[PDB]
Amino acid sequence: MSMIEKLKKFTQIPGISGYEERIREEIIREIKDFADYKVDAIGNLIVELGEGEERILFMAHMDEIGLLITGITDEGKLRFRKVGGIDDRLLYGRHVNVVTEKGILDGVIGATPPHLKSVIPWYDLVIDIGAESKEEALELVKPLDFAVFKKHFSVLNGKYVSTRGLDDRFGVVALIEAIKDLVDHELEGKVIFAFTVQEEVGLKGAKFLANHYYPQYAFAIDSFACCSPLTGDVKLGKGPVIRAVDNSAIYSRDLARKVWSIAEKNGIEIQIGVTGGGTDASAFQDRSKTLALSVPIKYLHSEVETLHLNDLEKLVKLIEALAFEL
Amino acid sequence: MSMIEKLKKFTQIPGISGYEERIREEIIREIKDFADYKVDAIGNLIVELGEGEERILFMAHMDEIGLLITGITDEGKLRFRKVGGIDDRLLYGRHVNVVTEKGILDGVIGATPPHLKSVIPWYDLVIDIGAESKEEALELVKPLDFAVFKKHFSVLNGKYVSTRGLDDRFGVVALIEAIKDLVDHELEGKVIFAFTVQEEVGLKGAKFLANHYYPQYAFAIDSFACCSPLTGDVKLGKGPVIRAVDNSAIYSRDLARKVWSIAEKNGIEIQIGVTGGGTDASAFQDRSKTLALSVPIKYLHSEVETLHLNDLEKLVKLIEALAFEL
Amino acid sequence: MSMIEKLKKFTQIPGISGYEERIREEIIREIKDFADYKVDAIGNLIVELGEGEERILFMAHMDEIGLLITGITDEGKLRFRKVGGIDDRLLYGRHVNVVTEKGILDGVIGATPPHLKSVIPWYDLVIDIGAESKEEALELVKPLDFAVFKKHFSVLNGKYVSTRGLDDRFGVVALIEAIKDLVDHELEGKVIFAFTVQEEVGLKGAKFLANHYYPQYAFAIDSFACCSPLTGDVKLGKGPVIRAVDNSAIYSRDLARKVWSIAEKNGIEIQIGVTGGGTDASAFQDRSKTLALSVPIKYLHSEVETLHLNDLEKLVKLIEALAFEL
Ligand SMILES: [Co+2]
Numbered sequence A, B, C: 001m002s003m004i005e006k007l008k009k010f011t012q013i014p015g016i017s018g019y020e021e022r023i024r025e026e027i028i029r030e031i032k033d034f035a036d037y038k039v040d041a042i043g044n045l046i047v048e049l050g051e052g053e054e055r056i057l058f059m060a061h062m063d064e065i066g067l068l069i070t071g072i073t074d075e076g077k078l079r080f081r082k083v084g085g086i087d088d089r090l091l092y093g094r095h096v097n098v099v100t101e102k103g104i105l106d107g108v109i110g111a112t113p114p115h116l117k118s119v120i121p122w123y124d125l126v127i128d129i130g131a132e133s134k135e136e137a138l139e140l141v142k143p144l145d146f147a148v149f150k151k152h153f154s155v156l157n158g159k160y161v162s163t164r165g166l167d168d169r170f171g172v173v174a175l176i177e178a179i180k181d182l183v184d185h186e187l188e189g190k191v192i193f194a195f196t197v198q199e200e201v202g203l204k205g206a207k208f209l210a211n212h213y214y215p216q217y218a219f220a221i222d223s224f225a226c227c228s229p230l231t232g233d234v235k236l237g238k239g240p241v242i243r244a245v246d247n248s249a250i251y252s253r254d255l256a257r258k259v260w261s262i263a264e265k266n267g268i269e270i271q272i273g274v275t276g277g278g279t280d281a282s283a284f285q286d287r288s289k290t291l292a293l294s295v296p297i298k299y300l301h302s303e304v305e306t307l308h309l310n311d312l313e314k315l316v317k318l319i320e321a322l323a324f325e326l
């Protein structure tokens, strides 16, 4: 499986914050023959390599943003709440997959035709699943089931991938790759790989992880929103990015410098910049030197979020070198 | 060296959140002869006096609000983001010091003359450093360098001092004065003095400190914004003020009573009130009894922030008395 | 005795329109040993070179913009009026020097902290001098005293100077320089150098001068606001500018041609353009060929107004050539 193929597979699995089971399972499926692993009370998936002192923690989150079903209407439609940050403009006139205990169902968030001028807020929207009444709907879906967008998967001009969930399924893919490449090597102290839950709603998996683990270095592998005047000269295609500062943290300048040095040593093109949002790494600013490492991502938090495949390839190289040299 | 001159010394040194090096080095220079010290992995400077159980922690922060260089424009101007809370109205038509590895350079944030109505927001502003191109500017300044206002220092009518950085360099100076005066005295158990980092961006230095110290009483020494209908009868010149409640916390009422009692027994005039903001002390409200002790400061977070020298004198006396009697 | 040091010395002297004493006194000190001079009834300082017909007049103004103390509040703050054009945005949160008959006092125009959106109008502002009451304040300052901003002085990348008062203290320095460089030479007719008063409040000094002098050519040496769509391709560093049209006049075109020609004749780089504002030259449009000669200035009428040292270097050579050849 090429990288394109891995990104397609992991982005297609539905799993919002608190509902990460299907992604965890699949990570288990392809790590199990390589490494042992455990699962948290909150649902984090942790893989430890090496032995001794906890030297490095790498975190990529399994949750994507989406919709939580809050109730069913008399007309048999689904009311919902947003989970994570979503622009209301992106909810209107969209197919969704409704994920229930029994299986997965097509749903549709409607639009009103010109035949029959403002942004419709999420609380005025519902999901149509083709039920004719509340009773018919409660047979298919229950409150606290969830929904995520149906996901087109695109490759732009051979170099870019666009699809909902790159954030942070690219991070999941990257850590899996790193795990396979590293299991057979001998490593100084422990290097910990953690696939976290509930990142999109306040870094909940990460904070849980922060009791239980006390790494010298704690890294989040996550998106870097690009591009605008805030993001300086960070560009898609110019390499992985040190996320030095975001809204959640000024990260360790000591650690950024080491990463930058290790990348140059290895001939790995690398970028550094400032952006918006937070990462799991900020949950460890408490105890460890922390940093976030990313690929830059365009149109973040939409169906068309886009990354450059070369940045990702380089990110995997960088993560492995850090495991060796940091 | 008068208090005036000690205040000016420490306020003139540049160090925003995450970039506190220059302040820490100077504090060490001043405290080196008198006591041992340790530096945190996040950069807190810690000084223990005495032996036994951790009775009292005093925190004062080293970081000041300022600007983080995010990028360079095509014409060699510096783009930036704010660090800590700054009213955009205060950015327009100002001199800055841009701080880089290779040293400190002059900079200017321009203003548009009438010759050529509203507040210009931070993201539309740039710093002029006299570069003619992006290339020439990069030789001088890099992204993730920082800038801080040039600082006039004024003495109003003998008794008030006005300059940027009084918050919280007044507290830095207060604690240094307390260390010097208490080091040659037996008082047990342990009295801990911390000069914290990253207070202005969510008390990060203190939250890290909280994982390594567990004092009975945790104090922040910081500003008390004054005056308005929120701040009751607090006045500059009426003495140190107990910061009993702010936006970050309702502090320990029993701790405030003891402090009140110790002040009155030592004949120290003292005040108590409500104001806005948070302090380092709130990072300990999950484990210690907390309080913030302040001098009242007018025009907080600007180049003309003002304190009354006599309140500062008395705060120093109050802090020593607490060391002995709390 | 660098140019930069002269600019600093002359910019730092306080003197608004009508209150130019301190500046005039310092110019007198500097030329005392070189030429005779007269002071007229409004305050202009005039230096005559040569004998005969009044050929050339050069005017540069001594007054700067600033604040006039109008009264003292109950709580002992200073109310004020603006003198000359100042954007209200530049008054908020600033240090000032209050100039009294007794001496110079520190002062501050406050800013309200977030802890306790629009431009605050001048009439809603006051200066804080640390008086506790009207009584104490009136002992320190009286109505009809004045105030100017405290002035940072910056050099940008070695070639730009920035500080309040380059307008028109650069012109004052330029004319002093020329007077020293011409006194030991024989000119045709008279060349008259005048340091005017009250330029910033409607050219009152120059209007007074115009009833006592009738030059063939009348020159203002003053700033040229730059840069915008109005100013064409005028740029700092590209040499002295012929201010050919502003809001106060369409200046003498044939005089512009002559200057242009004497400039090229001397290999002196030079610019011409349109800008806003008025100059002292406009007061002579009544009776003489008039022109205004400048260096381009950025951020005019602020603390960060900026000129290029080479432009100033060349302007001085141009003035001297005009004295020889015009
Ligand atoms: Co993410």
Ligand SMILES: [Co+2]
Pocket: A167, A200, A301
């Ligand atoms: Co996200």
Ligand SMILES: [Co+2]
Pocket: B167, B200, B301
């Ligand atoms: Co503050």
Ligand SMILES: [Co+2]
Pocket: B061, B167, B168, B199, B222, B223
């Ligand atoms: Co503070």
Ligand SMILES: [Co+2]
Pocket: C167, C200, C301
């Ligand atoms: Co002017």
Ligand SMILES: [Co+2]
Pocket: C061, C167, C168, C199, C222, C223
């Ligand atoms: Co002028």
